[PDB]
Structures are given as C-alpha cells and as structure tokens.
Paper text:
Here, we describe a cytotoxin of [name], [name] (motility associated killing factor A) that to our knowledge has not been previously reported. [name] functions as a potent virulence factor and we find it  is pathogenic to C. elegans and zebrafish. In this study, we identified a novel virulence factor of [name], the secreted [name] protein encoded by the mak operon, and demonstrated its role in lethal bacterial infections of C. elegans and zebrafish.
[name] can be described as a two-domain protein, a tail and a head. The tail consists of a bundle of five long helices (helix 1, 2, 3, 6, and 7). α1 ends in a short β-strand, β1. The head domain consists of helix 4 and 5 and three β-strands that together with the β1-strand of the tail domain forms a four-stranded sheet (strand order β1β3β2β4). Like [name], HBL-B and NheA have their head subdomains turned upwards, packing against the tail helices. The FTPP motif in [name] is located on the short β1-strand and the loop that connects it to α2. F47 is in turn stacking with the third residue of the motif, P39. Thus the motif is likely to be important for rigidifying the loop between β1 and α2.
Residue numbers in the entry: 6 to 234, 240 to 365
C-alpha cells in the first residue's frame, strides 16, 4: 500500500535530507596521499578538499540533524491542536447542527477555532520555509567548495600532457558511477511506500588507484547510498565493478604518481553527489511546504465560508472535516513518529574494483 499525500512529502523530504548527510560522510571518506615526491600542486588541492570537508561537517554536526528533525516534528507537533480543533467543530455541529449566519455564536466559535488553527499552519509554513533557506545558504557554500575542487583537479590534469587519454577514460567511468549511485538514492527519496525504521547509510571509499588508502599516491573517492529494509554492499560492489573494472586494469599500466593524477576528479565524486542531493532536497522541501500551504488555504476557505453566512451543515461536509482526512492525518502522524525516532545506521567500508 502507498503513501497518502502528507506521508509522501514528509517521507520524501526527510529521506532527501538523509541523502545529504550520507554524501557529507562520503566527502569525509574522500582522501588522497602525496606520492613519495610530493608535487607542486598537492598542498593547494589538499586544502580545497579540506574546505569541502569543513562544509560537510557543518551539516553533519549542526544543520543536518536540525533540518531533518524539523520535517517530522512539524507534523507531530501540530497533532494535538489539530485533533482538539476538529473535535471541537464536530461537537459544535452536534450541539447546533442548523446554525448559520455570521451573528450565530456556533458559527463564531467554529470560525475562531479554524482561524487559530490556520494561524498555527502559517507558522509551520514559515518554519519549513526557513529551514529550506538554511539548506539553500549552506548549499551555496558547499557548491563553492565543490567548484573549487573540480576546477583545481581540472587545472592540474591539464598540465600532464601524456595522460589526457587515461583521464578521459577515468572521468567517463566516474560519471557513470556517479549517475548510477545518484539513481539509487533518488529512487529511495521518491519511493511511494513506507520505508520503515530500518533506515541506513552505506558509505564507502573507492580506490581509484592501485595504492590503497593511506599509502603513497593513493586516491580514494567517496560514494554513499541510503537504503532500508534496495541498496546493499553487494549492489555497490557490482556497480563499482561495472564502472571501474576497466579503469583499474588501465591504472596498473601507469606509474603511481600518474595514476594519482588520472584519478583526481574522484576527489569531487562525493561533493558532486552532495550538490545533487541539495538539488533534490530543495525540491521536495518545497513540496513539503506546499503540503502545509494547501492545508492552510483549506482552513482559510472554511473561515471565509462561515463569515459569508455558510451553515455549519455545509462546513461539516468539507474535506478537512471528513473521516478520510482524519484517517490520512492520523496515518501521517504515525509515519512522522517513526521517522523522528528512526535510528539510522551508518556502515563504512573501503571498496575497490575487481582485478
Ligand atoms: C492536515 As495535512 C498538513 O496532512 O494536509
């Protein structure tokens, strides 16, 4: 069975911010080690990686947990007043089911109940919008760091005239792998069934050189995918194998220092993935804001109707007052509670393509 509209935007928004977190961890799992003879460009490119890692940590340590928690708590924290409000309206109707007219006290109370509930929705709208603005601002900083890393690698790669053909091959495989991993994550974000509570993050370094992480001239690109009880470590290995198997063979033909230069775009695999995840999050956070805006305007419509002389009878038939809406809301709250307490596992490994 499928997610109802409020469930869908709740879950999608939350999973998308969880992908940002996963890819920030992937940035932190990106690394490279100088060759035995450290070249002119190493320190400056390393600083650019450090800058990307710094921005990643701001999300992991501060902004991320706050944005991600705001999505379910907006639903959870609205529940008590929403229920009491709808119950009060039902009770008003039961006591005076023919009440109509702006001077009728039942109408007046119903109007005041829905006006106050709408004012609460407007506050929630602003809260979500503010969160999406904080994400936006942070994402500008991450984009800057990403662009600087990309451009740094690109300029270095231009200066070694012999390797241009191998760099092209590596960067084709890198683009292929990025796209494949991105699809795994986007598929989850946009899934239309309940993900459950077994949500996890798979974070890998990917050897792009013969030299393993920590040894001279090594390059380790980062990848991450979110899944739930569908991503697996075996799936990630088969993709790495699919995309990089041939590059791993080619890299063995090259000197250690050369393999490193060929792999330098890998240092921004993780940050390109974070940039994509920022894109997706901004979109589904707008969808989530829209969930609240729609609801707010529905309540406003009830207020307008009452003030123009509508009967309570006409109001009790509206969508917001209906049994279906109550049951969808109740299901959205439950979904949101499960997300808010979900304990998201992080598993970290170092992977290499096949030989
Ligand atoms: C009451 As609602 C935010 O699920 O439309």
């Amino acid at each position: 069975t499928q997610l109802n509209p409020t469930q869908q935007t709740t879950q999608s928004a939350f999973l998308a911010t969880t992908v940002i977190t996963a890819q920030c961890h992937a940035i932190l799992n990106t690394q490279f080690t100088p060759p035995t003879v450290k070249p002119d460009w190493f320190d400056d490119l390393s600083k650019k990686l450090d800058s990307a890692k710094l921005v990643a940590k701001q999300w992991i340590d501060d902004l991320g947990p706050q944005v991600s928690a705001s999505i379910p708590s907006s639903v959870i924290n609205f529940d008590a007043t929403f229920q009491a409000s709808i119950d009060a309206i039902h009770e008003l109707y039961k006591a005076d089911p023919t009440a109509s007219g702006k001077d009728n006290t039942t109408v007046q109370q119903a109007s005041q109940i829905m006006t106050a509930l709408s004012s609460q929705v407007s506050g929630i709208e602003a809260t979500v919008k503010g969160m999406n603005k904080e994400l936006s601002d942070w994402g500008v900083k991450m984009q800057a760091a990403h662009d600087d890393l990309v451009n740094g690698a690109t300029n270095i790669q231009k200066t070694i005239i012999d390797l241009q053909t191998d760099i092209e091959s590596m960067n084709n495989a890198i683009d292929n792998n990025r796209a494949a991993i991105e699809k795994l994550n986007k598929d989850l974000v946009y899934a239309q069934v309940a993900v459950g509570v077994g949500i996890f993050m798979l974070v890998a370094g990917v050897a792009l050189t013969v030299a393993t992480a920590g040894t001279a001239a090594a390059v380790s690109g980062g990848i991450a995918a979110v899944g739930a009880a569908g991503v697996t470590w075996g799936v990630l290995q088969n993709q790495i194998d699919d995309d990089y198997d041939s590059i791993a063979q080619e890299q063995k033909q090259k000197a250690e220092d050369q393999q490193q230069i060929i792999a330098l775009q890998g240092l921004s695999n993780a940050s390109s993935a974070v940039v994509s995840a920022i894109e997706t999050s901004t979109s589904v956070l707008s969808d989530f804001e829209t969930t609240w805006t729609v609801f707010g305007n529905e309540l406003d419509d009830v207020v307008t109707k009452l003030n123009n002389g509508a009967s309570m009878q006409s109001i009790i038939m509206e969508k917001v007052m209906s049994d279906a809406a109550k049951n969808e809301w109740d299901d959205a709250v439950e979904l949101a509670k499960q997300l808010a307490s979900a304990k998201i596992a992080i598993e970290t490994k170092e992977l290499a393509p096949a030989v």
